[PDB]
Amino acid sequence: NLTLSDLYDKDVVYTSRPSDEHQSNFLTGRELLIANQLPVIVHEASATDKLHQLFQVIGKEVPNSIYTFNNQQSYENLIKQLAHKENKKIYFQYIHDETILNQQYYALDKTLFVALNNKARIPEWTNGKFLPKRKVVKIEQFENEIKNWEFPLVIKPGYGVMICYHDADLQKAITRIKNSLIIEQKIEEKANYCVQFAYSESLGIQYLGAATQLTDKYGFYNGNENTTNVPEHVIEAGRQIMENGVNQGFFGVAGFDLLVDEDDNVYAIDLNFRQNGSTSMLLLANELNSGYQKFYSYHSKGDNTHFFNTILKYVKEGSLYPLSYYDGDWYGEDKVKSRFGCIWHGDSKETVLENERAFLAELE
């Protein structure tokens, strides 16, 4: 299976940190087990002895090719040092301000990265295909325009995504809104997929697989599950979107949130020209039970020692594959909440989800 160094040239250094600072630090370790030879910028608390212990159980090692930082200033100074004095190109997962690093030191064209990930611009990347009823509306005209829409509908920035089923939901959304907004019909989906692809010049476009997104009825993220039953026309919709981005210079990993309705129509509701936590579930498939897999993340309830030791219990049982660990005790005992990203895997959904619930009960 592919690793990230297969996609990125030797001069690239990778950061998955968003520009909650502790949650952002926790994300720096997200890709460590798939990075291989790619150097990764990681918070010190994301690679303590606790991470080494978890990886050791499953026969993995922490990459030696990490650069660490411990606060905002050290993060920003490290980026400048690598680009200005070590001839590195920085591959970002999230938009960073120009004061941090001028565009000429980006591994991937910043203007293209912003355009590919701009939700208002989805129709450009699908060539007008795969769209629900959807309009981009300036905020001053929004309240009057929204009266023309039937429920259920979705409001997105052009607060986060606001799914509205009725007038009460809409009035709450309007209060939170008070330059542009996306209004979209809420599709009554029978399936969703996050379909993922990689590209490099030597490899061409490669389909990596797909994960289902677990979301509540308001779209809030509750994890990702494995799936091998992706319809060919869903894969092809994703491949077309990938090719559109690649043709303008995209390289690396991308994932597309594709919904399918009861008539098998495909809707592209979110394009992520960047990777996510579930990319690791696809690329580590050789080490996971294929029966059922669920990727998610968890926070300490307070006692970081009990959090870690409960995690270690389940890792040693073999049900729980550790991906990332932010050690809040790096700041002092229980001063900051530890955080953990992982894959539950096993023979069936029933047994795996029972293990997850047992773990959550043991924590609380």
Q: Which residues are catalytic?
A: 274
3-state secondary structure of 22: helix
Looking at beta carbons only, is 69 or 193 nearer to ligand ADP? Answer: 193
Binding mask 68-107 for Cl ion (x = CB under 5 A): ----------------------------------------
Q: Which position among 109, 257, 261, 354 is part of the footprint of Mg ion (CB under 5 A)?
A: 257
305 labeled part of a ligand binding site: no
Binding site for Na ion (CB under 5 A): 270, 272
Task: Find how far residue 323's CA is from the centre of its chain.
Answer: 13
163 is in an annotated binding site: yes
CA–CA separation, 345 and 294 (whole Å) = 7
Residues that bind Mg ion (rule: CB under 5 A) add up to a total of 2
Which of 3, 19, 53, 118 binds Cl ion (CB under 5 A)? It is 118
18 vs 219, which CB is nearer to ligand ADP?
219
Out of 76, 189, 270, 303, name the contact with Mg ion by CB under 5 A. 270
* Residue 285 backbone phi and psi in degrees, to 5: -55, -30
Residue 13's binding partner among Cl ion, ligand ADP, Na ion, none (Cβ under 5 to 8 angstroms by kind) is: none
- Asked whether the beta carbons of 324 and 26 are under 8 A apart, the reply is yes
* Sheet with strand 66-69: strands edge to edge: 66-69, 40-43, 12-15, 89-92
Query: CA 144, 164, 170 angle in degrees (round to 5)?
Result: 40
Nearest to 347 by CA among 281, 291, 297: 291
Q: Which residues contact 10 (CB under 8 A, 6 or more apart)?
A: none
**Could you say which of ligand ADP, Mg ion, Cl ion, none residue 154 binds, taking C-beta under 5 to 8 angstroms by partner kind?**
ligand ADP
Minimum Å gap between C-beta 274 and Cl ion is 15
Read out DSSP for 118-169? Answer: -GGGHHHHHTT-S--SEEEEEHHHHHHHGGG-PSSEEEEE----EEESSHHH
Q: Which of the residues 153 through 182 are near ligand ADP (CB under 6 A)?
A: 154, 156, 160-161
Chosen from Na ion, ligand ADP, Mg ion, none, partner binding at 230 (C-beta under 5 to 8 Å by type): none
Q: Based on the shown chain and the rule CB under 5 A, indicate whether residue 114 belongs to the binding site for Cl ion.
A: yes
| Residues from 10 through 39 that contact ligand ADP (CB under 6 A) | none
* 156 in a known ligand binding site: yes
Residue from 219, 193, 220 nearest 208 by CA: 193
Pick from 58, 66, 112, 115 the residue near Cl ion by CB under 5 A. 115
215 belongs to the binding site for Cl ion (CB under 5 A): no
The DSSP bridge pattern shows strands 89-92 and 12-15 to be: parallel
Contacts of ligand ADP in 246-285 (CB under 6 A) = 257, 259, 269-270
CA distance 345 to 341: 13
Query: What is the SS3 assignment for 219?
Result: coil
Strand ranges (E), the chain: 12-15, 40-43, 66-69, 89-92, 134-138, 153-157, 162-164, 180-185, 191-200, 204-215, 221-227, 252-260, 266-272, 292-299, 320-326, 339-346
The footprint of Cl ion (CB under 5 A) covers 114-115, 118
The footprint of Mg ion (CB under 5 A) covers 257, 270
Annotated binding-site members: 119, 154, 156, 161, 163, 184-185, 187, 192, 215, 257, 259, 269-270
Annotated binding-site members for Mg(2+): 257, 270
The footprint of ligand ADP (CB under 6 A) covers 132, 154, 156, 160-161, 184, 186-187, 189, 213, 215, 219, 257, 259, 269-270
